[PDB]
């Protein structure tokens, strides 16, 4: 419903009050917990609009498909017939 964050004000989550668990996961991934402004304010003018915001909103490190793996279904299903080698069992030529 509502998050409770009155601790861990600094850019580090030592204590386990509040939702430390996803905060901790985010900290390993981007190095900034909560708002990117807090970290810069501690490090110390500029604002907090400049945020990476990709790994925070949408990204799945395990299921990411690199652009090397990008192939349309027609490409992946109509391989050149003579040298296709992407399948385990194929009837081998047996003169």
């Amino acid at each position: 419903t509502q998050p409770y964050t009155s601790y861990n004000k600094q850019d580090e989550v030592p204590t386990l009050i509040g939702n430390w668990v996803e905060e901790r996961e985010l900290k390993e991934l981007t190095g900034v917990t909560r708002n990117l402004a807090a970290s810069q304010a501690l490090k110390d003018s500029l604002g907090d609009a400049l945020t990476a915001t990709h790994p925070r909103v949408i990204e799945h490190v395990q299921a990411q498909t690199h652009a090397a793996d990008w192939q349309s279904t027609v490409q992946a299903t109509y391989r050149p017939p003579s040298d296709a080698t992407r399948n385990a069992a194929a009837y081998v030529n047996t003169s």
């Binding site: 419903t1 509502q2 998050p3 964050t5 509040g18 939702n19 668990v21 996803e22 905060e23 901790r24 996961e25 985010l26 991934l29 917990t33 909560r34 708002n35 990117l36 907090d48 609009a49 400049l50 945020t51 915001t53 990709h54 790994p55 925070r56 909103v57 949408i58 990204e59 799945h60 490190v61 395990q62 299921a63 990411q64 498909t65 652009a67 090397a68 990008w70 192939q71 349309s72 279904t73 027609v74 992946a76």
Partner: protein, 426 residues
């Protein structure tokens, strides 16, 4: 081939558009310096839809930027992917509207709309086969709603055969930014029911509760919401940009979702959305995408679909998939909670598949529901408009600009007629 001309109005439209062109530039693998640096050749074949080759691979976007205060222009150019927009697309006033629909639609529009019409024309005949226009703006502000709506009227007058999508945020009671939200919302939606083709309603509260629950962020700044709305926009336009098993263009979605000409206010969703700490629980299969897709807490509008009936729905899938599982999942979600769907239309759900997931994903989907629960939102606005108009509050800053009272009576009557038609088909 088919060309989408992007238009951004006001503060909300400019910042959302800034994130949008960031995502699109990401998905076509161009660096913020303007040259191609991707690897797959799947991307060079469909950049004509969203960019133009200038010289030496300088792919500049086909976007128009519109506002009245240099604060938004500086926020556009200060961020990365700022110096790829054409300097002649920084068409831009100097005075500022400030939450006045009359100022944004009669005074400032009077001398700004002609120059942006010169720019939109030039950028329109610069390409060959228009697919349509895509506009992102707000409804509470002045320079976005009024100016943008006047542009919508002008372009739908000149080019009447091209599609038109509007991504417009609507106000909320608990999160109410300005004070004249009903005075601007009512007049804009009154003009949108006549001129815009289809409107995909956004709001801040639903996005806000989404970053609460599904994403479990501690402080969801605007950059996160802008990325979510931008993710939805890319999920819409994925069909023209990438090959698929069943392509579905913008017109294809409009005919499969609009049964009546005034009946075109959708609600939108996006999947998958999980936290950083729980990215590992979930597998990426059709059931786990669908249970999240039809969840009411994943709507990007504050209208409970369980409080009405779906008229039509559409799902745009991305990534290599199995169409059997796609369709049987749509059939199950149509048969199980059968009361929440309309009776006199079989097969309410249109589906489509394209083979390229968004970068960083494996298999994603985008949901567009033309439901009847949107009358809840319009009644939420109308009761506030009647409460204000009952005693003429804040009215003179509109009356003294050229607008009269029958404009407000027309807006209220139309919105009331529209919610009556939604209630009829429920």
């Amino acid at each position: 081939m088919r060309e989408i001309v992007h238009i951004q109005g006001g503060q909300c439209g400019n910042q959302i558009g800034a994130k949008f062109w960031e995502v699109v530039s990401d998905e076509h693998g161009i660096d913020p310096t303007g040259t191609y640096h991707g690897d797959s050749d799947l991307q060079l074949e469909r950049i004509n839809v969203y960019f133009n080759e200038a010289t030496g691979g300088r792919y500049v976007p086909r976007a128009i930027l519109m506002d009245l205060e240099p604060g938004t222009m500086d926020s556009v150019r200060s961020g990365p992917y700022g110096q790829i927009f054409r300097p002649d697309n920084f068409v831009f006033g100097q005075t500022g509207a400030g939450n006045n629909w009359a100022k944004g639609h009669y005074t400032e529009g009077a001398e700004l709309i002609d120059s942006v019409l010169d720019v939109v024309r030039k950028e329109a005949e610069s390409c060959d086969c228009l697919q349509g226009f895509q506009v992102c703006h707000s409804l509470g502000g002045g320079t976005g709603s009024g100016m943008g709506t006047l542009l919508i009227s002008k372009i739908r007058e000149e080019y009447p055969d091209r599609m038109m999508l509007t991504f417009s945020v609507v106000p909320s009671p608990k999160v109410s930014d300005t004070v004249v939200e009903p005075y601007n919302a009512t007049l804009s939606v009154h003009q949108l029911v006549e001129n815009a083709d289809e409107c995909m309603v956004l709001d801040n509260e639903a996005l806000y509760d989404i970053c609460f629950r599904t994403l479990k962020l501690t402080t969801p700044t605007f950059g996160d919401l802008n990325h979510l709305i931008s993710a939805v926009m890319s999920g819409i336009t994925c069909c023209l940009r990438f090959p698929g098993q069943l392509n579905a263009d913008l017109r294809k979605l409009a005919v499969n979702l609009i049964p009546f000409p005034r009946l075109h206010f959708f609600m939108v969703g996006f999947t998958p959305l999980t936290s950083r700490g729980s990215q590992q629980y979930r597998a990426l299969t059709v059931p786990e995408l669908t249970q999240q897709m039809w969840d009411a807490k994943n709507m990007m509008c504050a209208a409970d679909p369980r409080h009405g009936r779906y008229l039509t729905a559409s799902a745009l899938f991305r990534g290599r998939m199995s169409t059997k599982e796609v369709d049987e999942q749509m059939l199950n979600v149509q048969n199980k909670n059968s009361s929440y769907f309309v009776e006199w239309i079989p097969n309410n759900v249109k589906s489509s598949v394209c083979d390229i997931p968004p970068k960083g994903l494996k298999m994603s989907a985008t949901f567009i529901g033309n439901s009847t629960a949107i009358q809840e939102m319009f009644k939420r606005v109308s009761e506030q408009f009647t409460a204000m108009f009952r005693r003429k509050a804040f009215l003179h800053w509109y009356t003294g600009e050229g607008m009269d009272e029958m404009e407000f009576t027309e807006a209220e009557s139309n919105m009331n007629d529209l919610v009556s038609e939604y209630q009829q088909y429920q």
